[PDB]
């Protein structure tokens, strides 16, 4: 009355912070560019950015975790973790489409390695 | 479809710098020697001046390729500090780690 | 040809054939996009050059009335155009 009376689940990658990148986490993309003496780091980085945007737009709501972009010689492996929500026929169609389109866009033999999980692999609750 | 007008202007500059580079080099080579008569060196100063101003290699800026930021750009990645830190902190730049 | 993931491994002959047909249809859609818009895939970055990863051109380039254009249309297997030009 009178005044004086008054008086979220996270995956393993999400759980760990950027300063654990070489201690507990790894690197999502692997290539030779950033090594001492090597060339074309910027080209690989731009390729990585486009690959991530393209995959996230071509597999909407399927990717359970981040992509892993591996590079061996001339090859380009997109190792992704997806859900078991979309039907397998659509997964095969999208894999074929993505392989062909990325192979012709980067002029290299791209290849996808989908791994399905039932649901987001929760590590803790931040 | 570039980031903004400023990036488009710099893409225009880099195009003509490539097209005019050979001619600029040759005309510039005549003026950088103390052999040919001064009558010829004085004219190449006129020939080089008349070439389109954007063809000069000194008018090109190293803007970021994702944000067109004029400064704070690491040339090895062509990425401004803000965009680099975003990718480096997510472990999306192979080999990059925070120092200890 | 299939993927080792349990959810994607075909379980029956019909399912195996269906998955293969779906994959081929996806490849065909990608090929259609690539050939329909070569301008987005002309930029070559591969050394040595890879000819099999470049767009294919199915359109006549010679437009005048001449025997060479006829030979071009015969090379492209464009039957109706070849008859019309003959």
């Amino acid at each position: 009355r009178e005044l004086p009376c008054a008086w979220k689940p996270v995956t393993y990658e999400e759980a760990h912070a950027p300063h654990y990148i070489a201690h507990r986490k790894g690197w999502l993309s692997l290539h030779t560019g950033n090594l001492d003496g090597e060339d074309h780091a910027a080209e690989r980085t731009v390729e990585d950015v486009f690959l991530r945007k393209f995959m996230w737009g071509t597999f909407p709501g399927c990717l359970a975790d981040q992509l892993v972009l591996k590079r061996r010689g001339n090859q380009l492996e997109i190792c992704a973790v997806v859900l078991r929500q979309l039907s397998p026929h659509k997964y095969y169609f999208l894999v074929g489409y993505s392989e062909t389109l990325l192979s012709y866009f980067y002029k290299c033999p791209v290849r996808l390695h989908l791994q399905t999980v039932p649901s987001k692999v929760v590590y803790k609750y931040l | 479809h570039y980031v903004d007008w400023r990036m488009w202007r710099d893409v225009k500059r880099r195009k003509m710098a490539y097209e005019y580079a050979d001619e600029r080099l040759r005309i510039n080579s005549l003026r950088k020697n103390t052999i040919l008569p001064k009558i010829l060196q004085d004219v190449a100063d006129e020939e080089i001046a008349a070439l389109p101003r954007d063809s000069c290699p000194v008018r090109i800026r190293n803007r970021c390729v994702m944000t067109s930021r004029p400064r704070g750009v690491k040339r090895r990645w062509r990425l401004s500090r803000i965009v680099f830190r975003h990718l480096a902190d997510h472990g999306q730049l192979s080999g990059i780690q925070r120092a200890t | 040809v299939f993927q080792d993931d349990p959810y994607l491994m075909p379980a029956s002959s019909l399912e195996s054939r269906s998955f293969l047909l779906a994959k081929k249809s996806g490849e065909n859609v990608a090929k259609f996009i690539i050939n329909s818009y070569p301008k987005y895939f002309q930029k070559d970055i591969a050394e040595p050059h890879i000819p099999c990863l470049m767009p294919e051109y199915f359109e006549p380039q010679i437009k005048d009335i001449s025997e060479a254009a006829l030979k071009e249309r015969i090379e492209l297997r464009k039957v109706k155009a070849s008859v019309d030009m003959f």
């Binding site: 071509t58 | - | 996009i33 301008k39």
Partner: peptide, 19 residues
Amino acid sequence: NHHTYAELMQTLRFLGLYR
């Protein structure tokens, strides 16, 4: 390029293959 990259998204979304 940023034309190849941006107009390719435009074509892909119009064809309904990208979100």
